[PDB]
Design a protein around this ligand. Structure first.
Ligand SMILES: *[C@@H]1O[C@H](CO[C@@H]2O[C@@H](C)[C@@H](O)[C@@H](O)[C@@H]2O)[C@@H](O[C@@H]2O[C@H](CO)[C@@H](O[C@@H]3O[C@H](CO[C@@H]4O[C@H](CO)[C@@H](O)[C@H](O)[C@@H]4O[C@H]4O[C@H](CO)[C@@H](O[C@H]5O[C@H](CO)[C@@H](O)[C@@H](O)[C@H]5O)[C@@H](O)[C@H]4NC(C)=O)[C@@H](O)[C@H](O[C@H]4O[C@H](CO)[C@@H](O)[C@H](O)[C@@H]4O)[C@@H]3O)[C@H](O)[C@H]2NC(C)=O)[C@H](O)[C@H]1NC(C)=O
Ligand SMILES: *[C@@H]1O[C@H](CO[C@@H]2O[C@@H](C)[C@@H](O)[C@@H](O)[C@@H]2O)[C@@H](O[C@@H]2O[C@H](CO)[C@@H](O[C@@H]3O[C@H](CO[C@@H]4O[C@H](CO)[C@@H](O)[C@H](O)[C@@H]4O[C@H]4O[C@H](CO)[C@@H](O[C@H]5O[C@H](CO)[C@@H](O)[C@@H](O)[C@H]5O)[C@@H](O)[C@H]4NC(C)=O)[C@@H](O)[C@H](O[C@H]4O[C@H](CO)[C@@H](O)[C@H](O)[C@@H]4O)[C@@H]3O)[C@H](O)[C@H]2NC(C)=O)[C@H](O)[C@H]1NC(C)=O
Ligand SMILES: *[C@@H]1O[C@H](CO[C@@H]2O[C@@H](C)[C@@H](O)[C@@H](O)[C@@H]2O)[C@@H](O[C@@H]2O[C@H](CO)[C@@H](O[C@@H]3O[C@H](CO[C@@H]4O[C@H](CO)[C@@H](O)[C@H](O)[C@@H]4O[C@H]4O[C@H](CO)[C@@H](O[C@H]5O[C@H](CO)[C@@H](O)[C@@H](O)[C@H]5O)[C@@H](O)[C@H]4NC(C)=O)[C@@H](O)[C@H](O[C@H]4O[C@H](CO)[C@@H](O)[C@H](O)[C@@H]4O)[C@@H]3O)[C@H](O)[C@H]2NC(C)=O)[C@H](O)[C@H]1NC(C)=O
Ligand SMILES: *[C@@H]1O[C@H](CO[C@@H]2O[C@@H](C)[C@@H](O)[C@@H](O)[C@@H]2O)[C@@H](O[C@@H]2O[C@H](CO)[C@@H](O[C@@H]3O[C@H](CO[C@H]4O[C@H](CO)[C@@H](O)[C@H](O)[C@@H]4O[C@@H]4O[C@H](CO)[C@@H](O[C@@H]5O[C@H](CO)[C@H](O)[C@H](O)[C@H]5O)[C@H](O)[C@H]4NC(C)=O)[C@@H](O)[C@H](O[C@H]4O[C@H](CO)[C@@H](O)[C@H](O)[C@@H]4O)[C@@H]3O)[C@H](O)[C@H]2NC(C)=O)[C@H](O)[C@H]1NC(C)=O
Ligand SMILES: *[C@@H]1O[C@H](CO[C@@H]2O[C@@H](C)[C@@H](O)[C@@H](O)[C@@H]2O)[C@@H](O[C@@H]2O[C@H](CO)[C@@H](O[C@@H]3O[C@H](CO[C@H]4O[C@H](CO)[C@@H](O)[C@H](O)[C@@H]4O[C@@H]4O[C@H](CO)[C@@H](O[C@@H]5O[C@H](CO)[C@H](O)[C@H](O)[C@H]5O)[C@H](O)[C@H]4NC(C)=O)[C@@H](O)[C@H](O[C@H]4O[C@H](CO)[C@@H](O)[C@H](O)[C@@H]4O)[C@@H]3O)[C@H](O)[C@H]2NC(C)=O)[C@H](O)[C@H]1NC(C)=O
Ligand SMILES: *[C@@H]1O[C@H](CO[C@@H]2O[C@@H](C)[C@@H](O)[C@@H](O)[C@@H]2O)[C@@H](O[C@@H]2O[C@H](CO)[C@@H](O[C@@H]3O[C@H](CO[C@H]4O[C@H](CO)[C@@H](O)[C@H](O)[C@@H]4O[C@@H]4O[C@H](CO)[C@@H](O[C@@H]5O[C@H](CO)[C@H](O)[C@H](O)[C@H]5O)[C@H](O)[C@H]4NC(C)=O)[C@@H](O)[C@H](O[C@H]4O[C@H](CO)[C@@H](O)[C@H](O)[C@@H]4O)[C@@H]3O)[C@H](O)[C@H]2NC(C)=O)[C@H](O)[C@H]1NC(C)=O
Lengths: 218, 5, 218, 218, 5, 5
């Protein structure tokens, strides 16, 4: 997240951090106690038998007792198209089931095919790069953004921060877009670099998947 | 540009 | 335009600004009173029934009486190839015909297949991003550049600003390259990011199209 | 090279600079007195009958007597795949044979299929862009980096500079990765831009080619 | 990288 | 993002 602010610890306890030996590479959502939802592209070409799913994280550079670490048992994809960046969703079934508590809770999804109107105020959030030089976040960042249908396709949900250059960056993929309490996007892709100020960012439209996610978490 | 993030 | 300067108001009155509900997304040229020429990629995947073509613009963030607003009635493409970025030209026939005047005049094209020698001093111009953080331009920028055949293909015209890092950026697409009074390129694409200092920028070679544009404006 | 330091003159005398009329576009290695090894992508779409191979360079912006200039007589490719960036190797047979001396010597390659363990300390080096604004290098830069198998494929060798944002950039392609005295990579590609701090950089794995390079230099 | 602008 | 350098 470029130009966002430090979230309040565990102010979003459905927020997951997918990690490899060295560190965070993408974000995810706790959609069930034993399932997480992220961006397909994040695990397409990773050794998923190495990936760690860290729940209850806040300051990744720190040591937090708060945290619960799983491993992915299985992946469910729904026809990612890497060359058009279509259906950039996955689900990751964990080798366990977490302990729901204050710092780890399950997100609500919207209803099947709820379409987001232009103008809708949402919150984008991630541990991705803080900007064209500043590295990846230690502390979870959150960003106020708006739904924009211009410069977008209908098979994404697109956000834009008007009048500043701010938005999602590398490693924010997989991360939720929470609109009105409900998880409307997953962080897929940027145009022009991050924080272009011109092109909206693009999120996999969760409400277009919901019935699929449902038949998989029940 | 489209870079996947 | 990275590292260019503020043009003089209406110092280039063939310069167009293509805009969607929020703002400028690419530039164009007034080639006839009811036609404009831009970069195919600029409208490939836009709702062209939303696009606005603003003539007689200078300081987009301002309100100028000077301005004339049309809508595109029709598009004429000549075999854009999005994966090689070949033939990145379009023509946009407007729902009207503008009023030619001091702040809105029709550009001259060159002759069919005029090839630009290496060394040729030209002027690149646009309301695209001013640089890796500074946003899009309010005030039309213009940049002195040179034709370079190295690091180029023959199916582009390529420019380079020697000894500084300067050049075209996001939203400068569609915008003219005016060489010797005549419109030789359209702003297509950059390599390495904008203003790399290493790779030339690439423009659709207008003189290779001219007979096509001619059979369409007469 | 972003965030590397000035190498000591001719401290690496196998280092080559491939140049076109205006200047350096990629690096190479002196693998034999009449052969050089670079990144396929560097000459795929260049007029190789224009390219210059400058040996014994240090401060490219200067005039150095030290230097020996050849032209490529022929290219040997081994199935570059530009769309997956697979086999990004070439060999360039020079119109002569250089004079081996203190400022021009032949690199050692490793053995066929030597695989590099995670953790291996190496030196990356190049005259490519010094960073998101600072241009290309005048003076050869060198950078201490580590082999990382995460965020990588097996058909590359990948490096990462931990705890800073540093790494290879545009024009560093073709350039050697020298590990333990031996040439283990060629500079192919970056993810996220240069110096992302998140994604490793990727090098063509020379030890996977060696028997091929051998049947061509003997 | 080639990004269309 | 993969840009060839
Ligand atoms: C499923 O799976 C899972 C996972 O797995 C994994 O992954 C995958 C992918 C694969 O790879 C596999 O193989 C693997 O293994 C399981 O489990 C899990 O595991 C993981 C791993 O194993 C984990 O994670 C990690 O962990 C860690 C730990 O470590 C350490 O230890 C030591 C000893 O103890 C120490 O010292 C340190 O500190 C650390 O820590 C810990 O410990 C401590 C102590 O010290 C504790 O504390 C506490 O206690 C005490 C007593 O007295 C008291 O006082 C209190 O108060 C406190 O203090 C704590 O600390 C702990 N920790 C925490 C909690 O945090 C960790 O640490 C890590 O982390 C990290 O962080 C940071 C950042 O990086 C850093 O700095 C650090 O260093 C580190 O690194 C991680 O997390 C996990 O945890 C687990 N999980 C759980 C348990 O939940 C399983 O089993 C499975 N399941 C099934 C099968 O079903
Ligand atoms: C073709 O088509 C066209 C177009 O269309 C469109 O587009 C497309 C795409 C689609 O979407 C459709 O649907 C659409 O609609 C047509 O027409 C055109 O239109 C357009 C739209 O409609 C336009 O544009 C726009 O416009 C505007 C206007 O507004 C306003 O108004 C109000 C009331 O009036 C005001 O208040 C304001 O200011 C504004 O302005 C105007 O007004 C005023 C007044 O105030 C004026 O002034 C003048 O007057 C007075 C009286 O007394 C005097 O004093 C004098 O001196 C002066 O002052 C002026 O101002 C006006 N304006 C101008 C000129 O500028 C506008 O405004 C807009 O703009 C913008 O700018 C900026 C930036 O953004 C901002 O700030 C602002 O706010 C705004 O937004 C635009 O431009 C146009 O114009 C039109 N065109 C013409 C007319 O040319 C058509 O019809 C067609 N054709 C055919 C069909 O054939
Ligand atoms: C193979 O091939 C090769 C190559 O070729 C080329 O390339 C190709 C690609 C194609 O294009 C073709 O066509 C071409 O041509 C051959 O050969 C080679 O060549 C090249 C070219 O030709 C070369 O290079 C270049 O060179 C140059 C030279 O120039 C000049 O000169 C003048 C007169 O001399 C002068 O003035 C100046 O300075 C320069 O230099 C030179 O000279 C001088 C004098 O001044 C010298 O010095 C010395 O001497 C004296 C006497 O007294 C004494 O004192 C001493 O001490 C000293 O001083 C020197 O300087 C020289 N130089 C040098 C060495 O360096 C050059 O210069 C150039 O460079 C550059 O650098 C910089 C950067 O850019 C700049 O600044 C400058 O300006 C310049 O530009 C270049 O390098 C080469 O060299 C050659 N190589 C050899 C010889 O080795 C061949 O033949 C062939 N082979 C076979 C066929 O087999
Ligand atoms: C940027 O984005 C954020 C987030 O965006 C939203 O949420 C995300 C998740 C997505 O869903 C987006 O789509 C959403 O837009 C936007 O932030 C929102 O701002 C609102 C105001 O504009 C605010 O709503 C108003 O809240 C009033 C009640 O507020 C209480 O209670 C609610 C419910 O619990 C709580 O959410 C509020 O934050 C606030 O909570 C209390 O706060 C105090 C102070 O911190 C606490 O007191 C301290 O507590 C500590 C505890 O240790 C200690 O004890 C201290 O001593 C003590 O002082 C207290 O404990 C909290 N209570 C509880 C129970 O937790 C409502 O009355 C009001 O309603 C009325 O007005 C609205 C506006 O007109 C009307 O729409 C409405 O109909 C009513 O008329 C509002 O609801 C939101 O809560 C806030 N949302 C979030 C998630 O923070 C932000 O607007 C945006 N900015 C811009 C620029 O876009
Ligand atoms: C960066 O690029 C720019 C632009 O590049 C060119 O143009 C673009 C569009 C592309 O086509 C590129 O391919 C082109 O290269 C380059 O700028 C050019 O610089 C030239 C000098 O190097 C200059 O040419 C010389 O002009 C002399 C005459 O100048 C008059 O008249 C012409 C024609 O009208 C006009 O264009 C000039 O600007 C100048 O105009 C007068 O200016 C004065 C001062 O502003 C005005 O007076 C003021 O007016 C206001 C009005 O309200 C008020 O009344 C004030 O009180 C008053 O003082 C006056 O009104 C203007 N008159 C008119 C009628 O408008 C020629 O004599 C000279 O020719 C001789 O020399 C040349 C060089 O040796 C020879 O080639 C030639 O054969 C002759 O020997 C030149 O033509 C260009 O006009 C200028 N082009 C543009 C479009 O600006 C620039 O070089 C470049 N820099 C570099 C670093 O690359
Ligand atoms: C960043 O990377 C660099 C480079 O990385 C390595 O190399 C590249 C090419 C890749 O292959 C990578 O995989 C490699 O990792 C790393 O730099 C290395 O640091 C080492 C120390 O950590 C150092 O090794 C130790 O060297 C001792 C002997 O040193 C002498 O001799 C050797 C051989 O000649 C030479 O390489 C050394 O630099 C040093 O050379 C002498 O230096 C002095 C001072 O400059 C010279 O004296 C001056 O000379 C001028 C001449 O005009 C004038 O006369 C002045 O008056 C005079 O003072 C002198 O002339 C030089 N002599 C010669 C003959 O040239 C060893 O004893 C030691 O071994 C012991 O310790 C090791 C560590 O525990 C053990 O492993 C080992 O078993 C032994 O126990 C080491 O070998 C390396 O040389 C150096 N490599 C390079 C290429 O520079 C660097 O570590 C890294 N940093 C990090 C953060 O990752």
């Amino acid at each position: 997240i470029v130009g966002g602010r430090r979230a309040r610890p565990h102010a979003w306890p459905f927020m997951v951090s997918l990690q490899l030996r060295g560190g965070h590479f993408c974000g995810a959502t706790l959609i069930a106690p034993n399932f997480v939802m992220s961006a397909a592209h994040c695990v397409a070409n990773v050794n998923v038998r190495a990936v760690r799913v860290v729940l209850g994280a806040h300051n990744l550079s720190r040591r937090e007792p708060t945290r619960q670490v799983f491993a992915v048992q299985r992946i469910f994809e729904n026809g990612y198209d890497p060359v058009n960046l279509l259906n950039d969703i996955v689900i990751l079934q964990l080798n366990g089931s977490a302990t729901i508590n204050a710092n780890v809770q399950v997100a609500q999804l919207p209803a099947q095919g709820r379409r987001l109107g232009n103008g809708v105020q949402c919150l984008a959030m991630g541990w991705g790069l803080l900007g064209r030089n500043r590295g990846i976040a230690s502390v979870l960042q959150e960003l106020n953004v708006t739904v924009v249908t211009s410069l977008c396709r209908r098979s994404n949900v697109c956000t834009l921060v008007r009048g500043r250059q701010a938005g999602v960056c590398f490693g924010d993929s997989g991360s939720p877009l929470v609109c009105n309490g409900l998880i409307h996007g997953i962080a897929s892709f940027v145009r022009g670099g991050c924080a272009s100020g011109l092109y909206p960012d693009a999120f996999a439209p969760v409400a277009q998947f919901v019935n699929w996610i449902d038949s998989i978490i029940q | 540009x489209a870079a996947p993030v």
